[PDB]
DNA sequence: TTGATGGGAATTTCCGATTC
DNA sequence: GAATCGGAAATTCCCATCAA
């Protein structure tokens, strides 16, 4: 048989906690989790019922999928990975109290060496590239689910599968984009209105303010000098498609990161006839 | 004789460099420095001419002037203090090479003990109190000048009374940083007040900041909540009502960031109240 | 060019408010 | 309570500038 991910983890939102912040790094959310009810990364073993073992490991975002320096902590976790005892019942396979613990940049080598020492290299990658020579990333991880089926004395290894990449909300370039507050949400259809936009930490060299409407797009209009300490952007509204507005049109304004073409939740802006 | 400070240090502006930032902590500027010419901490030895030695160490701000964990670095500095030289003439005694290196919060004890082991306790504070010192005193230091004058057979040991300078503040710690308004939404409003202002500024503490409007015999505060202080560098408030709600012509007042703790004030910005 | 300076941002660590 | 979380403080790091 094989393994399948039913509820992928959420990708943007949570901070990778360090070891010094102690305890557990909370618990990775389900992709569709909300305040009404919270979902958790959950899997099912297609075409099988019975006992077994599930082991979860952090792996790189990119194809070779090396084991990742960061490590999981929480329920049923030890030595930096998850390895729990599977029960026939299942409803299906929930993983709530998983938590991503990031390691200091200096402890990266000793961590990878610690991982492959325990024989965790799910995709048996050649050694010359696993020990690395380049970067790594450290802001993006992927869950790796390894399922072992009965034979113990749980050794029948199903194919290991990866989740969607998970992004550190604390890193400026992989963080979730968020408009916190604006001085005003309406302006002349001619544009040129100065807007003070308060947001979560961005990088001045990598941020734009993207206005859109049905078959229309326009950018902010500012310089890097206009990005105050990563959390305020002072820009001027762009001209709208129709400079002769007779009634207000509702457009959608949002922060956009060119690097990964990511977008904040839209904020309603209203072009006025002027 | 005795020693007196001719040019006090500047108090606010420079950040205490860490040991890891390497290099040198720049050079402590004189109080009266400008862009044309920079002044340096300078002293004179009242009523005396001859040889000697000057030793400078950092000590706490508060009445009992305990030795301070942080340390000086630069010309004629070693082991965390400044010592020796200036004997013959060159009578203005100035210290331009000075640099404040701060020590990590863990290694504070090791610093104090390393200092008093070198026998530096200018104001001979008891040992029972040196056992302390962990607090907000990591952000404020004082220069302590000890002057030793020649004595019997020619040895710089006499020791004049120690004098302290004005406190020097870490520009990097939020509670001791220099206040600065960087850019504002608009600088004119109804004399009735209630106009929303977006103020972009240097790192402040939401629990210890107000927006202080003043004019000839008049003061008024910002009006905002801590929830309105975005990520320590943005204040969204509403202007207060002016003294005269019946303005017939515009009146220009000065708006500025104010820190209640040490009543410090930013450079004022002009704001003109308008006839409603 | 070489090194010191200045000032912003990245990285780690802490801590009080909320919530479990 | 104990745990979680969002914000701030504490250290490092790196680059753009100015002195060497």
Author numbering:
A (entry chain B): 2 to 154, 157 to 277
B (entry chain A): 2 to 277
Publication passage describing the model:
To understand the difference in DNA affinity between Rel and RelA, we solved the structure of the mouse RelA(C46) chimera homodimer bound to a consensus NF-κB motif. The structures of RelA(C46) (green) and RelA (cyan) were very similar. However, the orientation of the second monomer (monomer B, right) showed significant differences in the RelA and RelA(C46) complexes in comparison with the Rel complex. Furthermore, the direct DNA-binding surface residues of RelA(C46) and RelA were nearly identical. Thus, the different affinities are unlikely to be due to differences in the DNA-binding surface. We identified Rel-specific residues on the RelA(C46) structure. None of these Rel-specific residues contacted DNA directly. Notably, the residue most likely to contribute to the increased binding affinity of mammalian Rel was Arg101, a sole residue in cluster III. The positively charged Arg101 is located behind the L1 loop, and its long side chain and guanidinium head form a network of hydrogen bonding interactions (dashed lines) with the backbone carbonyl groups on the L1 loop. This interaction could stabilize the three Arg residues of the L1 loop (Arg16, Arg18 and Arg 24) in a favorable conformation for DNA binding.
NF-κB proteins are characterized by a Rel homology region (RHR) that supports DNA binding and assembly of homodimers and heterodimers. RelA and Rel are the most closely related NF-κB family members. One specialized function of the NF-κB Rel protein in macrophages is activation of Il12b, which encodes a key regulator of T cell development. Thus, Rel-dependent Il12b induction does not reflect a distinct motif preference but rather a heightened intrinsic DNA-binding affinity of Rel homodimers that is important for functional interactions at a subset of NF-κB sites.
